[PDB]
Amino acid sequence: QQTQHLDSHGEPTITSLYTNWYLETLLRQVSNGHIAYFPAMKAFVNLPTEN
Amino acid sequence: ICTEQCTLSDQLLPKHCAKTISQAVNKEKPGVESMRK
Amino acid sequence: LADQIFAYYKVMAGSLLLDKRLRSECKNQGATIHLPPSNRYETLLKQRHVQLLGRSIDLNRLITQRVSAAMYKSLELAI
Ligand SMILES: [Cl-]
């Protein structure tokens, strides 16, 4: 049930929580210029900006 | 019990080995809690 | 060439999988685990017909022979 957007009780799951965070927090801050994708590290890494 | 075990599992995470790394670069232990006297 | 190529990608693998929190904690303790310097082997690995003294050399084939032997030695060692 945790793999669904809502569990059987209509409650948020870890799937919905993480989905929201990666978009509204991590990816949003990439667009704000504080984070960059490092194909060298196969990961997103914080940039040395004033953040 | 789960809370207790989650703590024991957290102690196995790599982050806790930082000290050991530094002490060897320039120069307890999980399981001890199970050693019953 | 084959020797440093295998070592380069083995280090890359070990670096990619090394716990991130541990890295930061080692840094904060003046024991930074240094990142692997990036390199440029792709073009060499793509050479399929090197013209030398009239011969056509498949550099890719030769490297694979060595790298394959390195993979087996790594596995043999781990076990
Ligand atoms: Cl570099």
PDB file of C-alpha atoms and ligand atoms in Angstrom:
ATOM      1  CA  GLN A   1       0.000   0.000   0.000  1.00  0.00           C
ATOM      2  CA  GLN A   2       3.004   2.253   0.589  1.00  0.00           C
ATOM      3  CA  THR A   3       3.827   2.018  -3.122  1.00  0.00           C
ATOM      4  CA  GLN A   4       0.579   3.828  -3.928  1.00  0.00           C
ATOM      5  CA  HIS A   5      -0.140   7.567  -3.898  1.00  0.00           C
ATOM      6  CA  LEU A   6      -2.525   6.866  -1.015  1.00  0.00           C
ATOM      7  CA  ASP A   7      -2.962   3.859   1.270  1.00  0.00           C
ATOM      8  CA  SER A   8      -6.235   1.953   1.685  1.00  0.00           C
ATOM      9  CA  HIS A   9      -7.290   4.596   4.219  1.00  0.00           C
ATOM     10  CA  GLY A  10      -6.693   7.522   1.869  1.00  0.00           C
ATOM     11  CA  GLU A  11      -3.574   8.507   3.788  1.00  0.00           C
ATOM     12  CA  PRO A  12      -0.255   9.695   2.292  1.00  0.00           C
ATOM     13  CA  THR A  13       2.408   7.024   1.812  1.00  0.00           C
ATOM     14  CA  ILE A  14       6.193   7.216   1.614  1.00  0.00           C
ATOM     15  CA  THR A  15       5.712   7.149  -2.158  1.00  0.00           C
ATOM     16  CA  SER A  16       3.660  10.348  -2.076  1.00  0.00           C
ATOM     17  CA  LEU A  17       5.911  11.969   0.527  1.00  0.00           C
ATOM     18  CA  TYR A  18       9.201  11.333  -1.282  1.00  0.00           C
ATOM     19  CA  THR A  19       7.690  12.172  -4.670  1.00  0.00           C
ATOM     20  CA  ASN A  20       6.665  15.580  -3.326  1.00  0.00           C
ATOM     21  CA  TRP A  21      10.013  16.243  -1.645  1.00  0.00           C
ATOM     22  CA  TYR A  22      12.242  15.373  -4.610  1.00  0.00           C
ATOM     23  CA  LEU A  23      10.186  17.749  -6.755  1.00  0.00           C
ATOM     24  CA  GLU A  24       9.313  20.623  -4.425  1.00  0.00           C
ATOM     25  CA  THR A  25      12.628  20.618  -2.564  1.00  0.00           C
ATOM     26  CA  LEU A  26      15.553  18.902  -4.293  1.00  0.00           C
ATOM     27  CA  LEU A  27      14.717  19.578  -7.952  1.00  0.00           C
ATOM     28  CA  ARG A  28      13.364  23.046  -7.160  1.00  0.00           C
ATOM     29  CA  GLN A  29      16.676  24.059  -5.595  1.00  0.00           C
ATOM     30  CA  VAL A  30      18.469  22.788  -8.692  1.00  0.00           C
ATOM     31  CA  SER A  31      16.513  25.341 -10.710  1.00  0.00           C
ATOM     32  CA  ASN A  32      17.450  27.946  -8.104  1.00  0.00           C
ATOM     33  CA  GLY A  33      21.105  27.346  -8.942  1.00  0.00           C
ATOM     34  CA  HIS A  34      22.179  25.802  -5.640  1.00  0.00           C
ATOM     35  CA  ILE A  35      22.450  22.202  -6.846  1.00  0.00           C
ATOM     36  CA  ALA A  36      23.962  20.579  -9.936  1.00  0.00           C
ATOM     37  CA  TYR A  37      23.919  17.098 -11.460  1.00  0.00           C
ATOM     38  CA  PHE A  38      27.316  15.380 -11.358  1.00  0.00           C
ATOM     39  CA  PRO A  39      27.370  12.544 -13.908  1.00  0.00           C
ATOM     40  CA  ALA A  40      30.859  11.943 -12.510  1.00  0.00           C
ATOM     41  CA  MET A  41      29.346  11.023  -9.144  1.00  0.00           C
ATOM     42  CA  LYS A  42      26.029   9.749 -10.515  1.00  0.00           C
ATOM     43  CA  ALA A  43      24.258  12.095  -8.108  1.00  0.00           C
ATOM     44  CA  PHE A  44      23.052  15.630  -7.464  1.00  0.00           C
ATOM     45  CA  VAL A  45      25.531  17.699  -5.457  1.00  0.00           C
ATOM     46  CA  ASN A  46      25.252  20.990  -3.563  1.00  0.00           C
ATOM     47  CA  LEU A  47      26.973  23.990  -5.146  1.00  0.00           C
ATOM     48  CA  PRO A  48      29.145  26.438  -3.151  1.00  0.00           C
ATOM     49  CA  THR A  49      26.615  29.265  -3.523  1.00  0.00           C
ATOM     50  CA  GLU A  50      25.149  31.726  -1.023  1.00  0.00           C
ATOM     51  CA  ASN A  51      22.199  29.555  -0.004  1.00  0.00           C
TER      52      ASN A  51
ATOM     53  CA  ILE B   1      11.791  -3.730  20.584  1.00  0.00           C
ATOM     54  CA  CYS B   2      11.822  -2.401  17.017  1.00  0.00           C
ATOM     55  CA  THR B   3      13.040   0.958  18.327  1.00  0.00           C
ATOM     56  CA  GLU B   4      15.819  -0.842  20.197  1.00  0.00           C
ATOM     57  CA  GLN B   5      16.825  -2.822  17.105  1.00  0.00           C
ATOM     58  CA  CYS B   6      16.638   0.223  14.819  1.00  0.00           C
ATOM     59  CA  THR B   7      19.200   1.784  17.145  1.00  0.00           C
ATOM     60  CA  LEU B   8      21.447  -1.276  16.868  1.00  0.00           C
ATOM     61  CA  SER B   9      21.156  -1.188  13.070  1.00  0.00           C
ATOM     62  CA  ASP B  10      21.927   2.530  12.994  1.00  0.00           C
ATOM     63  CA  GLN B  11      25.174   1.818  14.838  1.00  0.00           C
ATOM     64  CA  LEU B  12      26.281  -0.338  11.905  1.00  0.00           C
ATOM     65  CA  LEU B  13      26.020   2.524   9.411  1.00  0.00           C
ATOM     66  CA  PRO B  14      29.275   3.710   7.750  1.00  0.00           C
ATOM     67  CA  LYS B  15      28.964   7.226   9.210  1.00  0.00           C
ATOM     68  CA  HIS B  16      30.111   5.893  12.596  1.00  0.00           C
ATOM     69  CA  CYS B  17      33.483   4.757  11.244  1.00  0.00           C
ATOM     70  CA  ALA B  18      34.720   8.301  10.599  1.00  0.00           C
ATOM     71  CA  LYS B  19      36.738   8.345  13.830  1.00  0.00           C
ATOM     72  CA  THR B  20      38.432   5.048  12.965  1.00  0.00           C
ATOM     73  CA  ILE B  21      39.398   6.478   9.573  1.00  0.00           C
ATOM     74  CA  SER B  22      40.985   9.645  10.974  1.00  0.00           C
ATOM     75  CA  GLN B  23      42.795   7.911  13.841  1.00  0.00           C
ATOM     76  CA  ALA B  24      44.579   5.706  11.303  1.00  0.00           C
ATOM     77  CA  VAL B  25      45.222   8.297   8.589  1.00  0.00           C
ATOM     78  CA  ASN B  26      47.378  10.536  10.785  1.00  0.00           C
ATOM     79  CA  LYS B  27      48.463   8.136  13.545  1.00  0.00           C
ATOM     80  CA  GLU B  28      33.387   0.641  21.363  1.00  0.00           C
ATOM     81  CA  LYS B  29      32.068  -2.029  18.990  1.00  0.00           C
ATOM     82  CA  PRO B  30      28.660  -3.307  17.833  1.00  0.00           C
ATOM     83  CA  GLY B  31      28.121  -6.677  19.498  1.00  0.00           C
ATOM     84  CA  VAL B  32      29.433  -5.637  22.902  1.00  0.00           C
ATOM     85  CA  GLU B  33      25.851  -5.079  24.068  1.00  0.00           C
ATOM     86  CA  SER B  34      25.191  -8.770  23.385  1.00  0.00           C
ATOM     87  CA  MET B  35      28.147 -10.016  25.429  1.00  0.00           C
ATOM     88  CA  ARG B  36      26.313 -11.201  28.539  1.00  0.00           C
ATOM     89  CA  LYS B  37      28.171 -11.694  31.818  1.00  0.00           C
TER      90      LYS B  37
ATOM     91  CA  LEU C   1      47.002   1.423 -21.033  1.00  0.00           C
ATOM     92  CA  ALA C   2      44.856  -1.553 -20.020  1.00  0.00           C
ATOM     93  CA  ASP C   3      46.352  -1.522 -16.527  1.00  0.00           C
ATOM     94  CA  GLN C   4      45.463   2.092 -15.743  1.00  0.00           C
ATOM     95  CA  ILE C   5      42.098   1.747 -17.481  1.00  0.00           C
ATOM     96  CA  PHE C   6      40.954  -1.039 -15.171  1.00  0.00           C
ATOM     97  CA  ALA C   7      42.312   0.700 -12.072  1.00  0.00           C
ATOM     98  CA  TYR C   8      40.573   3.901 -13.157  1.00  0.00           C
ATOM     99  CA  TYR C   9      37.137   2.274 -13.394  1.00  0.00           C
ATOM    100  CA  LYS C  10      37.638   0.173 -10.267  1.00  0.00           C
ATOM    101  CA  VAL C  11      38.379   3.335  -8.287  1.00  0.00           C
ATOM    102  CA  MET C  12      35.380   4.997  -9.920  1.00  0.00           C
ATOM    103  CA  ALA C  13      33.181   2.112  -8.759  1.00  0.00           C
ATOM    104  CA  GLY C  14      34.502   2.195  -5.195  1.00  0.00           C
ATOM    105  CA  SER C  15      34.023   5.964  -5.125  1.00  0.00           C
ATOM    106  CA  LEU C  16      30.476   5.879  -6.500  1.00  0.00           C
ATOM    107  CA  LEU C  17      29.351   3.433  -3.811  1.00  0.00           C
ATOM    108  CA  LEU C  18      31.202   4.920  -0.833  1.00  0.00           C
ATOM    109  CA  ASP C  19      28.750   6.238   1.767  1.00  0.00           C
ATOM    110  CA  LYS C  20      28.260   9.993   1.391  1.00  0.00           C
ATOM    111  CA  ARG C  21      27.760  10.778   5.083  1.00  0.00           C
ATOM    112  CA  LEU C  22      31.030   9.003   5.847  1.00  0.00           C
ATOM    113  CA  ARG C  23      32.794  11.221   3.307  1.00  0.00           C
ATOM    114  CA  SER C  24      31.536  14.410   4.946  1.00  0.00           C
ATOM    115  CA  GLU C  25      32.391  13.125   8.421  1.00  0.00           C
ATOM    116  CA  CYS C  26      35.946  12.308   7.335  1.00  0.00           C
ATOM    117  CA  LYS C  27      36.247  15.792   5.861  1.00  0.00           C
ATOM    118  CA  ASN C  28      35.084  17.417   9.096  1.00  0.00           C
ATOM    119  CA  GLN C  29      37.852  15.492  10.857  1.00  0.00           C
ATOM    120  CA  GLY C  30      40.695  16.615   8.599  1.00  0.00           C
ATOM    121  CA  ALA C  31      40.846  13.186   6.973  1.00  0.00           C
ATOM    122  CA  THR C  32      39.129  13.901   3.654  1.00  0.00           C
ATOM    123  CA  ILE C  33      38.832  10.848   1.412  1.00  0.00           C
ATOM    124  CA  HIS C  34      40.010  12.306  -1.891  1.00  0.00           C
ATOM    125  CA  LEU C  35      37.900  11.963  -5.034  1.00  0.00           C
ATOM    126  CA  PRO C  36      39.283  10.176  -8.113  1.00  0.00           C
ATOM    127  CA  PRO C  37      40.672  12.492 -10.816  1.00  0.00           C
ATOM    128  CA  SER C  38      38.594  12.210 -13.999  1.00  0.00           C
ATOM    129  CA  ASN C  39      40.258  10.938 -17.183  1.00  0.00           C
ATOM    130  CA  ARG C  40      39.677  10.485 -20.928  1.00  0.00           C
ATOM    131  CA  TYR C  41      39.993   6.862 -22.067  1.00  0.00           C
ATOM    132  CA  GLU C  42      36.779   6.570 -24.106  1.00  0.00           C
ATOM    133  CA  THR C  43      38.359   7.500 -27.458  1.00  0.00           C
ATOM    134  CA  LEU C  44      41.171   4.985 -26.939  1.00  0.00           C
ATOM    135  CA  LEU C  45      38.650   2.305 -25.975  1.00  0.00           C
ATOM    136  CA  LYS C  46      36.823   2.985 -29.246  1.00  0.00           C
ATOM    137  CA  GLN C  47      39.841   2.419 -31.506  1.00  0.00           C
ATOM    138  CA  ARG C  48      38.999  -0.613 -33.641  1.00  0.00           C
ATOM    139  CA  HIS C  49      41.612  -0.229 -36.383  1.00  0.00           C
ATOM    140  CA  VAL C  50      44.870   1.535 -35.526  1.00  0.00           C
ATOM    141  CA  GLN C  51      47.057   1.919 -38.614  1.00  0.00           C
ATOM    142  CA  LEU C  52      50.642   1.139 -37.620  1.00  0.00           C
ATOM    143  CA  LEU C  53      53.465  -0.148 -39.834  1.00  0.00           C
ATOM    144  CA  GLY C  54      50.900  -1.423 -42.330  1.00  0.00           C
ATOM    145  CA  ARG C  55      48.989  -3.414 -39.728  1.00  0.00           C
ATOM    146  CA  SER C  56      45.410  -2.718 -38.688  1.00  0.00           C
ATOM    147  CA  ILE C  57      45.304  -3.009 -34.901  1.00  0.00           C
ATOM    148  CA  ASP C  58      42.087  -3.486 -32.926  1.00  0.00           C
ATOM    149  CA  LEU C  59      43.093  -1.679 -29.736  1.00  0.00           C
ATOM    150  CA  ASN C  60      39.668  -2.348 -28.218  1.00  0.00           C
ATOM    151  CA  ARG C  61      40.100  -6.106 -28.605  1.00  0.00           C
ATOM    152  CA  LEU C  62      43.530  -6.103 -26.947  1.00  0.00           C
ATOM    153  CA  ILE C  63      42.394  -3.980 -24.001  1.00  0.00           C
ATOM    154  CA  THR C  64      39.362  -6.197 -23.452  1.00  0.00           C
ATOM    155  CA  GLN C  65      41.671  -9.213 -23.174  1.00  0.00           C
ATOM    156  CA  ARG C  66      43.604  -7.557 -20.343  1.00  0.00           C
ATOM    157  CA  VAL C  67      40.606  -5.964 -18.623  1.00  0.00           C
ATOM    158  CA  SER C  68      38.718  -9.264 -18.699  1.00  0.00           C
ATOM    159  CA  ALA C  69      41.690 -10.961 -17.041  1.00  0.00           C
ATOM    160  CA  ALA C  70      41.646  -8.201 -14.419  1.00  0.00           C
ATOM    161  CA  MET C  71      37.963  -8.771 -13.642  1.00  0.00           C
ATOM    162  CA  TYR C  72      38.597 -12.472 -13.015  1.00  0.00           C
ATOM    163  CA  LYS C  73      41.565 -11.730 -10.761  1.00  0.00           C
ATOM    164  CA  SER C  74      39.464  -9.270  -8.750  1.00  0.00           C
ATOM    165  CA  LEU C  75      36.699 -11.839  -8.307  1.00  0.00           C
ATOM    166  CA  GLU C  76      39.224 -14.572  -7.530  1.00  0.00           C
ATOM    167  CA  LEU C  77      40.780 -12.313  -4.901  1.00  0.00           C
ATOM    168  CA  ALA C  78      37.509 -11.327  -3.218  1.00  0.00           C
ATOM    169  CA  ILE C  79      36.529 -14.980  -2.804  1.00  0.00           C
TER     170      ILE C  79
HETATM  171 CL    CL D   1      39.094  16.084 -11.020  1.00  0.00          CL
END
